[PDB]
Amino acid sequence: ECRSTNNPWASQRGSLGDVLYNIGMYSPCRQFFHKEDIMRY
């Protein structure tokens, strides 16, 4: 609660972490950035 975000480079609504990791092989970082995946969990 002292600061809102550690980095808004990955936490942004238009963050490129969403751009990289939303779109055949394995995807490790997909589990944190994909918004619609989080609703399954």
């Binding site: 779109i23 055949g24 619609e36 399954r40």
Partner: protein, 314 residues
């Protein structure tokens, strides 16, 4: 008195009873295995009475069920019991879980118009949000509709029989051959169910013990981007006539495709559709119209399922 004569023709034409061998008690396992072995040994000897006991056998066949293990994000909990199943096997190295494509799910992977299929888009808008979780697994819904290799990957399976739907992983049981019965012991005829929006019925014409059901997967391009289409057909006309009847249905699609591809036309673009054979329906069994939350869904009785290869038509 004459009904007592019919009480003998019934009780002499019944099949023999299936042997019940109790595996919980001790001296009732001895009396049950012995009456297998004392009764099979008199179905092998060359006398006339032992040949009399070998003729009463009634060989009724049983279907062959498949055990599929699906993500719950790609298979909706609201699916009518008897929905058809397409498998998808693009990559093998994972081999963890399986993709099963109901026709109301494959409607979202195509991107085909909601004016061609008016009712089933609203139902595919509530069972799936935007078709993302269905299409998160295929990175080639733009390169399998150009090169024309989507029909080579689907293998039709059969209707739903049993689905233990969980939160994360859905376990689905199908019926591949034969009449689709529920595997559990109150065996009910789970027949194949299709929405009335997808199925296009073709029909003095003779009828056999057969009216088949075909699956056509048609490539097209809407909004100058690749997007296939899938319809179901039903006629007992023989394979030479139905291929002539499907091309009449898609005259307005072949014309309006090659106008869009008039200038650039690569060799991979030429493949158009493919027709499978999903199974047979016996004539004298009409389909019953049924509404589900509202979706007009046909239900077939005694749909015994078969499988044919995809054959390209154009």
């Amino acid at each position: 008195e004459n009904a007592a004569r019919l009480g003998r023709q019934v009780l002499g034409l019944l099949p023999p009873p299936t042997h019940r061998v109790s595996l919980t008690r001790g001296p009732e396992f001895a009396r049950g295995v012995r009456d297998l072995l004392s009764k099979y040994a008199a179905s092998t000897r060359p006398t006339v009475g032992s040949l009399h006991e070998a003729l009463r056998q009634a060989p009724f066949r049983q279907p062959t069920y498949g055990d599929f293990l699906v993500y719950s994000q790609t298979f909706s909990p609201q699916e009518p019991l008897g929905t058809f199943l397409f498998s998808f096997k693009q990559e093998d190295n994972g081999s963890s879980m399986d993709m099963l494509l109901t026709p109301t799910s494959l409607f979202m992977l195509s991107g085909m118009e909601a004016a061609k299929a008016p009712q089933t888009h609203k139902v595919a808008g509530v069972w799936y949000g935007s078709g993302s979780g269905l299409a998160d697994f295929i990175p080639n819904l733009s390169e399998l509709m150009d090169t024309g290799e989507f029909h080579t990957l689907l293998t039709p399976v059969g209707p739903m029989v049993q689905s233990v739907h969980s939160t994360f992983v859905t376990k689905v049981t199908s019926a591949m051959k034969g009449v689709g019965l529920a595997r559990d012991e109150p065996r009910a005829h789970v027949g194949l169910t299709l929405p009335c929006d997808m199925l296009v019925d073709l029909d003095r014409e003779p009828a056999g013990l057969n009216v088949t059901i075909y699956a056509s997967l048609v490539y097209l391009r809407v909004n100058q981007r690749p997007s296939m289409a899938l319809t179901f057909f039903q006629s007992g006309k023989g394979f030479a006539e139905v291929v002539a009847m499907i091309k009449d249905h898609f005259t307005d699609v072949i014309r309006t495709k090659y106008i869009q591809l008039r200038h650039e036309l690569y060799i991979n673009r030429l493949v158009f559709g493919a027709v499978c054979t999903l199974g047979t329906v016996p004539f004298d069994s009409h389909p019953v119209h049924q509404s589900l939350n509202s979706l007009p869904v046909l239900v077939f009785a005694n749909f015994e399922a078969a499988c044919g290869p995809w054959t390209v038509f154009l």
